[PDB]
Design a protein around this ligand. Structure first.
Ligand SMILES: *C(=O)[C@H](Cc1ccccc1)NC(=O)CCCCCN
Ligand SMILES: [Cl-]
Ligand SMILES: [Cl-]
Ligand SMILES: [Cl-]
Ligand SMILES: [Cl-]
Ligand SMILES: [Cl-]
Ligand SMILES: [Cl-]
Ligand SMILES: [Cl-]
Ligand SMILES: [Mg+2]
Ligand SMILES: [Mg+2]
Ligand SMILES: [Mg+2]
Ligand SMILES: [Mg+2]
Ligand SMILES: [Mg+2]
Ligand SMILES: [Mg+2]
Ligand SMILES: [Mg+2]
Ligand SMILES: [Mg+2]
Ligand SMILES: [Mg+2]
Ligand SMILES: [Mg+2]
Ligand SMILES: [Mg+2]
Ligand SMILES: [Mg+2]
Ligand SMILES: [Mg+2]
Ligand SMILES: [Mg+2]
Ligand SMILES: [Mg+2]
Ligand SMILES: [Mg+2]
Ligand code: NA
Ligand code: NA
Ligand code: NA
Ligand code: NA
Ligand code: NA
Ligand code: NA
Ligand code: NA
Ligand code: NA
Ligand code: NA
Ligand code: NA
Ligand code: NA
Ligand code: NA
Ligand code: NA
Ligand code: NA
Ligand code: NA
Ligand code: NA
Lengths: 142, 150, 142, 49
RNA sequence: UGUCCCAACGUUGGGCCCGGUGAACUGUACAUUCCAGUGCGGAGUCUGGAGACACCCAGGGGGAAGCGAAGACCCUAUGGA
RNA sequence: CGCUCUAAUUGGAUGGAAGUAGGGGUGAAAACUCCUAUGGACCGAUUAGUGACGAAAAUCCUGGCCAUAGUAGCAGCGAUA
RNA sequence: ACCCUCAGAAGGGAGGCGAAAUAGAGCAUGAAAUCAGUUGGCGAUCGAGCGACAGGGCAUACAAGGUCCCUCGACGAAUGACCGACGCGCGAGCGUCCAGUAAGACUCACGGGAAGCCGAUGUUCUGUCGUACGUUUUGAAAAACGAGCCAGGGAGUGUGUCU
């Protein structure tokens, strides 16, 4: 009578102490939006980042308040870079064969959006049986 | 053209529309704004008083240069848009008629929804001095109305 | 009429600027202050020059306007406002929780703030706010 | 000759307009103009071997 | 002899309000300003103060170094006629 | 990093492709990805190629659209109807 | 189609077809600028590059994020005390000891708590910084030049030779 997600939805990965420390760091520190300069002043100017090149650009000149300029120093910790907020490493999956070789303790799987309902069902049931979590599960009424 | 922008329960609702009317779109926002919430019958009486010139239609947004009117309450600028008013009478005549053919008491129904939409312009061209011409267009208006049982 | 002042200050024979500076600081700390006997507040210096300054302020102006008070009432209040960011929310709140009075409409005798009193016995060059207002043309309503 | 088949000319300064070749009050030829030539197009002469 | 002293009253068409018709110029953004200062030395927007409840109608045009025109003067180009 | 089309290898789609709207996650970032709705037939990935391959600007070009504004004009003419 | 409405072969209402009429005639999809109505936030005593980063209010169906709050305790870089004891200084105050102790960001563990609750998103308030962008220029917020807004279009290419 209610919606229930298929699979090991509550499953958490197991991480070394250092990795969970680093993962927690990333989450606490965050980063600036890094949106393009003045994207908010002109609709024709989108948010996507572009290096400010004006010789007089306030941002390019690093004037405080004109937003941060992309630099390597803003990089996330090597050990956690790319991990799902849960700690898992994602594995893009298109069919049942893609599930092979996937460590359900360390990795979770994401079913490509193009995959249809029929194949998703099969992927979702065999992924669960392999102990693998599906980040984007189907919600059936049970 | 438009489609009803508001949902309406067929069992306690009556609908009506005007299509591509060549009349002031600005006068229509004003009229719609003013008669919403009124009774179909109240709306009709109101509009005839506007046409007659005894009742002003508040012009709250498109009021540049418009002269104040004593009868306008809580505001100052107003006019007597007879053309658009006549078109709305047609709209109400239709709505109330539909309403009756369905068993309701048309006149007593409330104007739950009424809105005007500019659907285009009948393009025109006016010859000007120096061998040039400029636009001379006519607005085309659509308007929806949803009556509802009290 | 009726002002729940957490503090009642007596300006009689006190240095206006030094009183104001302290009344400003307290109002910004959340205190409701009332300055009493403004007309008897004093300012050091050569009366001739002092008066010239205030007379200049009265004369200054234009269509935009420069409303400067002549009564010892406002003179004092304008002095305080000059020590508060009266255009900011916080500033305007503090300023509005401070009122100056001619004489003392309270029952309690105000207190004298430290370092604000002027010893008439060792000082001859100074003036009374009331004297200034009379010079400015005010109506001695006290 | 795609986009070059026209005698369009530029009015130059004077009418609050950009110096763009026009014909019958319609911009032409130049690459930034709709129906204009292609600046650096595919070329038959290119050795693709 | 209303050109002037020195302006008045009047006539007609507008102007103003109402119905209908219905453009254009112009628009980086923000914008209720004023006085001073500062700044590429001629600021609604910086700095300090002052003033400032919102919206609307009519006006005569002080400012936006107002709009309009890639200065027609002057110089420069191994330019043109 | 992203775009087009070619090739090899290899996948997805009417149990709903691309696109679009709103929303969730990742990447310093170019950008990648998911969810919901819409849509109703196409769509990728890796590797090696290919090139009329990336826009905020040019008084840029074309089209569309807002303010201007219910504003100016629909009075002026020795033919005031 | 039929019926009601209407000056009406218009339009509208009701209805019928089809998987779909939000496929109904310049009719696939249906972006932005932008318009009507409406929802959330602000709002008729208050100040202008419109924001970035902090932090509060109010608002939020699910999904695709799941964290967050307080007691206590563990760990604890740099830094680093009060009080009290003694000794100086005209004085503000300083020295020695207490003590590199108490404290000390992050992180974790036990217990307790939140589900509009944490993140996130919309708007708004407070703090700090802040006079667009691009170009010309020794120097641009510039009273130097460009653009009303949006979408789409818009600029190192080919042959030959040489290195
Ligand atoms: C001399 O002073 C010139 C005379 C002249 C120039 C060209 C044609 C006829 C007469 N006058 C000017 O240069 C005036 C310039 C006006 C500039 C206004 N922004
Ligand atoms: Cl890197
Ligand atoms: Cl309109
Ligand atoms: Cl004044
Ligand atoms: Cl202030
Ligand atoms: Cl003395
Ligand atoms: Cl840590
Ligand atoms: Cl190049
Ligand atoms: Mg934008
Ligand atoms: Mg008027
Ligand atoms: Mg002619
Ligand atoms: Mg062409
Ligand atoms: Mg100021
Ligand atoms: Mg020139
Ligand atoms: Mg000459
Ligand atoms: Mg010659
Ligand atoms: Mg391969
Ligand atoms: Mg550029
Ligand atoms: Mg006007
Ligand atoms: Mg004539
Ligand atoms: Mg006559
Ligand atoms: Mg269509
Ligand atoms: Mg110079
Ligand atoms: Mg483009
Ligand atoms: Na208005
Ligand atoms: Na009234
Ligand atoms: Na009124
Ligand atoms: Na003094
Ligand atoms: Na004055
Ligand atoms: Na031709
Ligand atoms: Na060839
Ligand atoms: Na005369
Ligand atoms: Na003017
Ligand atoms: Na132009
Ligand atoms: Na907020
Ligand atoms: Na330039
Ligand atoms: Na600039
Ligand atoms: Na300047
Ligand atoms: Na325009
Ligand atoms: Na190109």
């Amino acid at each position: 009578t209610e919606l229930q997600a298929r699979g090991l939805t509550e499953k958490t990965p197991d991480l070394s102490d250092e990795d969970a420390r680093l993962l927690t760091q990333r989450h606490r520190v965050g980063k600036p939006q890094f949106n393009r300069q003045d994207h908010h002043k002109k609709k024709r100017v989108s948010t996507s980042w572009r290096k400010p090149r004006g010789q007089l650009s306030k941002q390019r000149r690093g004037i405080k308040g004109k937003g941060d300029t992309v630099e390597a120093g803003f990089r996330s910790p090597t050990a956690v870079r790319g991990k799902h907020p849960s700690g898992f490493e994602e594995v893009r999956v298109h069919n049942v064969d893609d599930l092979e070789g996937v460590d359900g303790d360390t990795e979770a799987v994401r079913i490509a959006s193009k995959v249809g309902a029929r194949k998703r069902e099969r992927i979702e049931e065999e992924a669960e049986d392999a102990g693998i979590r599906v980040l984007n599960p189907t919600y059936v009424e049970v | 053209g438009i489609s009803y922008s508001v949902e309406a329960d067929p069992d306690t609702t009556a609908k009506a529309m005007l299509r591509e009317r060549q009349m002031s779109f600005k006068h229509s926002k004003a009229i719609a704004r003013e008669i919403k919430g009124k009774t179909a019958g109240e709306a009709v009486d109101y509009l005839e008083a506007v046409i007659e010139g005894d009742q002003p239609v508040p012009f709250k947004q498109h009021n540049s240069g418009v002269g104040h009117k004593s009868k306008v309450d809580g505001w100052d600028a107003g006019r007597y848009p007879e053309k658009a008013s006549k078109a709305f009478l047609d709209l109400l005549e239709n709505a109330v008629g539909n309403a009756d053919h369905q068993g309701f008491d048309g006149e007593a129904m409330t104007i739950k929804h009424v809105a005007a939409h500019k659907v285009g312009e009948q393009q025109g061209r006016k010859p000007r001095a120096m061998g040039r011409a400029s636009a001379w267009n006519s607005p085309q208006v659509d308007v929806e109305l949803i009556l509802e049982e009290p | 009429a009726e002002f729940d002042a957490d503090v009642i200050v007596d300006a009689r024979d006190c240095i206006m600027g030094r009183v104001a500076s302290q009344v400003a600081e307290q109002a910004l700390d959340g205190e409701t202050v009332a300055v009493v006997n403004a007309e008897r507040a004093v300012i050091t210096g050569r009366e001739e020059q002092i008066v010239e300054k205030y007379e200049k302020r009265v004369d200054i102006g234009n269509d935009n306007g420069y409303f400067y008070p002549k009564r010892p009432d406002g003179i004092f209040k304008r002095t305080i406002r000059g020590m508060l960011p009266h255009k900011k929310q916080r500033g305007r709140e503090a300023f509005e929780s401070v009122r100056v009075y001619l004489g003392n409409p309270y029952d309690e005798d105000g207190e004298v703030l430290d370092g604000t009193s002027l010893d008439r016995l060792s000082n001859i060059k100074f003036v009374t706010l009331g004297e200034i207002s009379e010079t400015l043309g005010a109506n001695k309503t006290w | 000759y795609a986009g070059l088949r026209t005698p369009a000319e530029s009015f130059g300064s004077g009418r609050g307009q950009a110096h763009v070749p026009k014909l019958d009050g319609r911009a032409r030829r130049v690459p930034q103009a709709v129906k204009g030539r292609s600046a650096h197009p595919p070329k038959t002469e290119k050795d693709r071997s």
